[PDB]
């Protein structure tokens with residue numbers, strides 16, 4: 001049995017993707033999630049949708065309760081969390097509207113708790129050092145890549161996401177710099193969402209959608225809120241189709257070994273007295 | 274009508290630059306500014322001076338209330354904010370005593386709010402993502418550069434400021450590293466001052482004064498508090514002359530289109546529900 | 547007269563190194579240290595041992611009270627602080643089990659106070675900007691290197707430690723990146739421990755022990771908590787022997803000029819009104 005958590009990002013957090021919807025507000029040991037969980041189905045598969053920034057997009061990236069969001073999805077019984085995230089492109093070949101099925105990150109955040117195991121919660125006791133060599137589930141990523149090909153979508157099979165704190169966009173010097181570090185796309189939300197999913201033993205993958213070329217590339221429209229939202233208005237349907245078609249495929253294969261290995265990694269990352 | 278906010282940095286925060294001075298303590302939604310606003314004039318031009326670290330230099334860079342400072346200057350009616358900032362040189366050609374009219378930054382701060390739009394203040398509602406491609410006003414910078422040439426000052430026309438959290442100085446490995454990233458000068462205060470000025474719709478520019486070569490360059494005196502203050506004692510008059518001569522030139526040209534474009538950029542960076 | 551503070555890191559915080567042990571719990575203006583001070587001797591030399599993470603390893607790196615730990619050791623009268631720290635190797639030639647007598651750092655921490663002089667404590671008044679060009683005591687390092695050679699240990703004479711916030715391990719993209727920045731080893735605790743020791747006027751040195759190759763190097767066992775603790779179980783005796791044999795050598799040479807120079811650097815880093 002699988003259950004798919006969906007975290008919707010900017011422009012890309014649409015409840016109408018699920019059939020048989022029911023709204024459920026929850027609390028967690030780490031506070032309230034961004035908004036109500038939306039429970040529902042894609043074909044025969046149970047899903048749980050959550051708007052990263054709230055359904056009215058009122059929560060900036062620095063203030064998103066990543067702990068509560070992941071906790072809530074875990075507690076509802078999710079085996080997988082597949083998210084969407086708008087991003088800037090740091091590579092000529094990654095065009096606005098393209099999907100990138102990211103496989104790595106570089107952290108540039110500064111303000112965010114990255115662990116459940118902070119010494120202050122009885123529900124997460126001990127000192128936990130989660131491995132991040134392979135932060136995203138490669139099996140979930142594989143299904144996303146295969147499905148995007150079946151849909152004929154422009155989709156990059158890997159990529160390194162640099163996650164900045166924000167909410168400001170990057171300077172040009174920063175944009176240039178991130179290119180030298182080997183970053184391929186830029187956003188404000190992947191870290192610590194991916195990290196906490198891993199501590200939760202959840203298969204996590206990210207549908208990154210390029211919306212702009214940040215500010216490094218000449219003769220392109222400058223990143224701005226309006227430019228991002230424009231690209232998403234034009235291209236959001238592709239992320240929706242990809243979730244709708246991927247999720248049944250996840251539901252039809254066997255995940256017990258993958259989930260057991262993740263559970264083991266998570267459990268053995270915690271040192272108790 | 275222009276009104277010029279002046280934020281004075283280390284060694285470079287002198288009330289006697291203004292004629293017809295009056296002290297005004299203010300409060301803001303983000304707390305108290307570093308010290309009293311000093312209201313006054315340079316020739317016919319209204320100005321507002323504020324000591325970044327307080328007039329006795331009692332507030333370390335991490336604890337400066339950048340939000341309150343920018344808010345106070347905005348509320349007093351400033352159209353421009355021209356600041357001074359001491360810095361380390363990361364380039365042989367940038368000698369101690371030189372001025373750099375910086376045009377870019379790299380953020381290495383970790384502790385600082387970078388936005389007015391934190392979800393907690395009625396005066397700044399919404400989610401704001403300000404563009405930082407061009408963080409400094411190029412027209413204000415142009416007048417500073419032109420004026421420095423008229424004064425015969427050693428002045429670099431551009432440069433990338435890496436802003437570290439401090440209050441410690443950088444290690445040698447860090448200094449080396451920042452050079453590879455393309456940083457030209459190093460300080461602890463540009464970020465988030467520049468960012469918040471942009472959200473405020475204010476033309477912001479920075480008179481950076483090199484005081485040392487940080488710790489990368491052989492056979493130079495090591496950076497220390499005493500070395501910084503020594504260089505400033507010797508060279509502060511140049512920043513003073515540059516402000517005194519630049520500000521009347523700003524006052525004599527037309528800023529309405531520049532200010533309108535900045536106001537638009539700022540306003541359209543905010544998403545409301 | 548010398549007195550050697552010892553901070554023990556992961557797997558490497560063993561009270562039985564000291565003869566004539568007495569436990570002493572203390573408080574400081576910055577809160578409680580990680581655990582009781584253990585007072586005792588190595589040959590004729592007074593020492594003070596403190597477990598960085600508490601004796602049961604219950605305090606994650608982000609939550610270690612670096613200020614209290616250094617303060618407590620200073621207040622007990624330590625002239626030197628020699629620490630152990632497990633780390634990942636970022637260089638082929640630094641093999642698991644090797645010691646590195648690190649001489650530089652790159653900060654990647656985000657959550658940590660790095661100064662005693664925060665404006666909130668009467669015991670540390672003023673604005674302090676400590677120089678970090680040479681963060682570790684070269685004389686203490688020299689004795690460690692010489693002693694490791696006398697013991698026949700695999701020991702690297704220098705190295706740059708990148709200190710990450712954690713508690714997660716690095717992604718592969720990050721690991722790759724830190725290699726390009728010239729980092730040689732990776733940990734979560736050197737910063738701000740080294741910085742605060744310098745403000746305290748204490749000779750600080752670090753016995754770094756490589757436990758893994760992080761996640762950059764093919765055909766090596768992946769970093770995990772279990773892998774780290776396994777390497778330490780196998781190799782901790784080497785750090786113990788090195789402390790036991792180094793400390794008497796420190797005790798037998800003259801430190802007054804070295805300590806005076808450090809005290810001066812620390813004192814002149816503070817600006818008062």
Ligand SMILES: C#CCSC[C@H]1CN(Cc2c[nH]c3c(N)ncnc23)C[C@@H]1O
Nearest residue numbers: 010086087088186187188214225228544
């Ligand atoms: C309000 C609103 C909507 S626009 C700002 C969103 C989009 N997101 C991703 C993003 C898209 N382009 C980016 C870029 N160039 N840098 C960082 N992040 C991004 C970053 C913010 O969460």
Ligand SMILES: C#CCSC[C@H]1CN(Cc2c[nH]c3c(N)ncnc23)C[C@@H]1O
Nearest residue numbers: 283359360361459460461487498501817
């Ligand atoms: C107290 C006092 C006066 S000296 C410390 C000031 C100077 N400033 C700028 C600065 C000058 N040189 C620097 C360097 N090498 N690194 C960072 N920042 C700087 C950083 C601190 O705010």
Ligand SMILES: C#CCSC[C@H]1CN(Cc2c[nH]c3c(N)ncnc23)C[C@@H]1O
Nearest residue numbers: 271556632633634732733734760771774
């Ligand atoms: C609980 C427990 C014991 S394992 C986690 C410890 C070891 N330490 C140093 C360390 C060893 N290898 C590392 C690596 N690859 N990255 C960062 N840090 C490290 C980082 C954590 O404090």
Ligand SMILES: [Cl-]
Nearest residue numbers: 110111384657
């Ligand atoms: Cl923080």
Ligand SMILES: [Cl-]
Nearest residue numbers: 108381653654
């Ligand atoms: Cl960084």
